[PDB]
Amino acid sequence: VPTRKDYGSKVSLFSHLPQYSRQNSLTQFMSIPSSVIHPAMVRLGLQYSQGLVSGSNARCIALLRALQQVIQDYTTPPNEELSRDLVNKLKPYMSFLTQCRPLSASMHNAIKFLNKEITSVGSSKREEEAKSELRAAIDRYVQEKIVLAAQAISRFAYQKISNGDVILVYGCSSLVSRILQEAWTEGRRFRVVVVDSRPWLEGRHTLRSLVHAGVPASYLLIPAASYVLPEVSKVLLGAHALLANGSVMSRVGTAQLALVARAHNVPVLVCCETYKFCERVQTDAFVSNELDDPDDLQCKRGEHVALANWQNHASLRLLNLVYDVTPPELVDLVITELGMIPCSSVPVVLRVK
Amino acid sequence: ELIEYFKSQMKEDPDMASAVAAIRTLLEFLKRDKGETIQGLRANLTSAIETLCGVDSSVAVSSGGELFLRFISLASLEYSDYSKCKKIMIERGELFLRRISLSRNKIADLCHTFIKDGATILTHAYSRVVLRVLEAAVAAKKRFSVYVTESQPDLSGKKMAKALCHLNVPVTVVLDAAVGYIMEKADLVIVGAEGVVENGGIINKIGTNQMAVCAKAQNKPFYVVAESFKFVRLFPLNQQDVPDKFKYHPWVDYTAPSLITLLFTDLGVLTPSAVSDELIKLYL
Amino acid sequence: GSELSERIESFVETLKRGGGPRSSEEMARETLGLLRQIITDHRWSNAGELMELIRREGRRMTAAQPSETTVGNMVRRVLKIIREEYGRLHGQESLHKLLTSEDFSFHYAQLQSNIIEAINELLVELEGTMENIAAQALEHIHSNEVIMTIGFSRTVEAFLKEAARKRKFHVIVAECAPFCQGHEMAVNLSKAGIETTVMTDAAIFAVMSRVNKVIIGTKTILANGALRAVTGTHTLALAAKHHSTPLIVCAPMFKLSPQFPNEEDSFHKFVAPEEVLPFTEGDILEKVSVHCPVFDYVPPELITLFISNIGGNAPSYIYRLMSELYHPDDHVL
């Protein structure tokens, strides 16, 4: 498998991060009937590259379904044990998926759990029995780590929402949308303020999700967040990962919103599951991040595009960050499936399980 | 029913806390209970905890009730007979009541070391734990000054000042509005707590949050002395998030853990990040 | 044998008179070896007598030098190890134990052997600690970054020289005024081509506006997450907090002391005033009070991260690590 090529000139501060282009892909230098990589893995990597699956739990679910299909299509070779052979076989697939798009924390945790489950397979176990048990374990993981873990968080966040509240959300989040919909269904009467940002503009995925539910929702961009915050009662933010030092790694417009919310005495709430907890730490968005396609910053304002041909200018760089890190002092409450714990109890949950 | 009269008569010892008396009443009514099922016992004791909290609106009573319910649920997981389990619960409750009575001295002998000679301490209201800590330091041949706030709602600082004068300690009574005036003349702030919330903050007399803010603004260390049975799983986001059942002019308020330096419990000297750890390990 | 007596006396006088092992790692290693020799070359029927003699030895060692907390840490670690081995061969305080609930007079033959093996593992862990901190270099240092360090620390030196073989950044070293040991670290870093700069302490704030990250080490870590560092480190922490600059601490696991900041008037190490004010000043030395404290106290709220052989942690979790290394009955020793 050939390595993916870099596109454009990266920033000096982010020169250690890969920057790819959505237009080009690796499937041009691969077999049409895939042989080295599994066809399901190739489809998943193409969907990750084209941006068809652009979430956090959705990416993990798609990866787990592709892994289930691979295990179902897996056949152990002679003279080899399944425990080592499957682990050695699933490594190039993860390398190709990382080449397509940098993996998320949920995907890393799922890969680690599946590797542990495969390594913990006995030798005397039959092939079909082991494959069926692995599929059942993946199904139970999906059930009790995403589906069952969201209902507990929705039930815990219901007692924190009161009548007449003004909740401010940001971007697109499955857990936040589910919590708001269930709170409106239970009987709570409030209104939501949706904040969005360029170039993904995924906040509209939540806005039209609330109007279809009946919740009165407003829409505005992230530069106008300090104007609407004086009327906001509480801020509900989604988390892509909770680091071992209490910091919150999420969409690039999260730490800024939490900082501006602190200046207005607005409590900041973070919702995340226990399967997204990382044992690693991070103090700034410079050591580990993701550089998306820099051609997405181009916008047509008026008649022409100011960034139509930015490659001609030598000293012109286009930075398109994806993730950012929020310090623990800006987070007031963290809602998980175990209960409402402070932002400093992240290692404890990492130690219990 | 006529259960509150046993809890009121249980508080004939002026040094006994409210949560301790509530737990003693709960254990007595568990001993005198004639039920034959664990579910009926749990229901009766939840109703009794509600009746006791209806009289005393303190957070310590609710904390002790939740702790007793958790102890019952933990002891009802090993034997599953309600007779063996009942005897084990009686023995464990006796041991727990014996161990709780030794928490005040355990906090005092461990916290009195943080007081230097010629220091100046600042207290808000009357607290038996703070009084024991102060009387344990004067017994160790230490000299210091104490400034006690008046606690305008009900004059509790005057009682603390009288106790300190009886203990031969130089104490000066200040007004509730002068806390920001003498804060520069104090070395440390030692206050009590009626309940420790999940995040590490405290729930104490109304004139505690402003004093904590003034101490943080002047880099003054803010120490809190409280027992372990006051750990309650509450997460107030602000002053309005505190339940009205505890505030009733409010009688109590919440102080965030960002303004607290250390906590001195019978479990030892902990940080505001250790209460949530114990609450998670207990599975309350 | 009296050889153990000669060794103990020589170690006590070497700690009390001057400096023996000039590195915390070698100090912990010799402490562990001396404790192992005491365990082997002594007669104890039960674990109680062994624990008592080990406690007495650790107490006299800490009385020889109170600031050298590594000896006490190793003694408490050996005590905790003996405790686990006794509890395993026989058959912490929290809310769960306070709601759902012991002497060492029993005798066991192979127990001692087990203990030895346990000490053995600790020994090997030592020669990992340094690199177990160094291997995490690239995870906290990116290219074209300005880093400031104070004093001479072998751990921070290894960290920087391991992060420089694949990245290139800026390093500034502020030499301490009493003991100008930052010059040696600056020369050792410049020998590897890291673009090192040397400065004094008075300029620590002056250049603080042009520093992206501060990485330091310490002598020991308290139970509340505080630090006992070289003098001038509290000023560096205050300057980093003023500019919201992250402060990273490289320290292994044998630098954790269960003591709390309540032993004032003896926390800092005071040396002869010859380093601050020379003897050739004249008659003014009879009316001038000169104090030269070596160590200083750093509060936990001025620290951002702790890097150890187990990884990266926050100060607000240090209280747990102590509970995983020492027993609450061995805090006073």
Swiss-Prot record, chain A:
GO annotation, biological process: cytoplasmic translational initiation; myelination; oligodendrocyte development; ovarian follicle development; regulation of translation; response to glucose; response to heat; response to peptide hormone
Keyword annotations from UniProtKB, A to Z: Acetylation, Cytoplasm, Disease variant, Initiation factor, Leukodystrophy, Phosphoprotein, Protein biosynthesis
Main location: cytoplasm
Stretches for region May bind the chemical integrated stress response (ISR) inhibitor ISRIB: 4-13
Superkingdom, natural source: Eukaryota
Locations listed in the record: Cytoplasm, Cytosol
Activity regulation comment: Activated by the chemical integrated stress response (ISR) inhibitor ISRIB which stimulates guanine nucleotide exchange factor activity for both phosphorylated and unphosphorylated eIF2.
Keyword Ligase part of the UniProt annotation: no
MF annotations from Gene Ontology: guanyl-nucleotide exchange factor activity; translation initiation factor activity; translation initiation factor binding
Associated disease: Leukoencephalopathy with vanishing white matter 4: An autosomal recessive brain disease characterized by neurological features including progressive cerebellar ataxia, spasticity, and cognitive deficits. Brain imaging shows abnormal white matter that vanishes over time and is replaced by cerebrospinal fluid. Disease severity ranges from fatal infantile forms to adult forms without neurological deterioration. The disease is progressive with, in most individuals, additional episodes of rapid deterioration following febrile infections or minor head trauma.
Family that this chain belongs to: Belongs to the eIF-2B alpha/beta/delta subunits family.
Descriptive protein name: Translation initiation factor eIF2B subunit delta
Source organism: Homo sapiens (Human)
Curated annotation (Swiss-Prot), chain B:
GO cellular component: cytoplasm; cytosol; eukaryotic translation initiation factor 2B complex; membrane; plasma membrane
Subunit structure: Component of the translation initiation factor 2B (eIF2B) complex which is a heterodecamer of two sets of five different subunits: alpha, beta, gamma, delta and epsilon. Subunits alpha, beta and delta comprise a regulatory subcomplex and subunits epsilon and gamma comprise a catalytic subcomplex. Within the complex, the hexameric regulatory complex resides at the center, with the two heterodimeric catalytic subcomplexes bound on opposite sides.
Keywords for the protein's UniProt record, in alphabetical order: Acetylation, Cytoplasm, Disease variant, Initiation factor, Leukodystrophy, Protein biosynthesis
Gene3D superfamilies membership: Translation initiation factor eif-2b, domain 2 (3.40.50.10470), Translation initiation factor eIF-2B, N-terminal domain (1.20.120.1070)
Modified residues annotated as N6-acetyllysine in this record: 31
Record gene name: EIF2B1
Name of this protein: Translation initiation factor eIF2B subunit alpha
PANTHER family according to UniProt: TRANSLATION INITIATION FACTOR EIF-2B SUBUNIT ALPHA (PTHR45860:SF1)
Recorded GO MF terms: guanyl-nucleotide exchange factor activity; identical protein binding; translation initiation factor activity
InterPro entries: eIF2B_alpha/beta/delta, elF-2B_alpha_N, IF-2B-related, IF_2B-like_C, NagB/RpiA_transferase-like
From Swiss-Prot, chain C:
Keywords: Cytoplasm, Disease variant, Initiation factor, Leukodystrophy, Protein biosynthesis
Activity: how regulated: Activated by the chemical integrated stress response (ISR) inhibitor ISRIB which stimulates guanine nucleotide exchange factor activity for both phosphorylated and unphosphorylated eIF2.
InterPro entries: eIF2B_beta_subunit, IF-2B-related, IF_2B-like_C, NagB/RpiA_transferase-like
Main location: cytoplasm
Classification lineage: Eukaryota, Metazoa, Chordata, Craniata, Vertebrata
GO terms for biological process, alphabetical: central nervous system development; cytoplasmic translational initiation; myelination; oligodendrocyte development; ovarian follicle development; regulation of translational initiation; response to glucose; response to heat
Main function: Acts as a component of the translation initiation factor 2B (eIF2B) complex, which catalyzes the exchange of GDP for GTP on eukaryotic initiation factor 2 (eIF2) gamma subunit. Its guanine nucleotide exchange factor activity is repressed when bound to eIF2 complex phosphorylated on the alpha subunit, thereby limiting the amount of methionyl-initiator methionine tRNA available to the ribosome and consequently global translation is repressed.
Listed result of changing residue 195 to G: In VWM2; with and without ovarian failure
Effect of residue 109 to V: Found in a patient with Rett syndrome-like phenotype; uncertain significance
Family under the similarity heading: Belongs to the eIF-2B alpha/beta/delta subunits family.
Keyword Zinc among record annotations: no
Superkingdom of origin organism: Eukaryota
GO cellular component, one term: cytoplasm
Subcellular location: Cytoplasm, Cytosol
The protein, known as: Translation initiation factor eIF2B subunit beta
Gene: EIF2B2
An example Gene Ontology molecular-function term: GTP binding
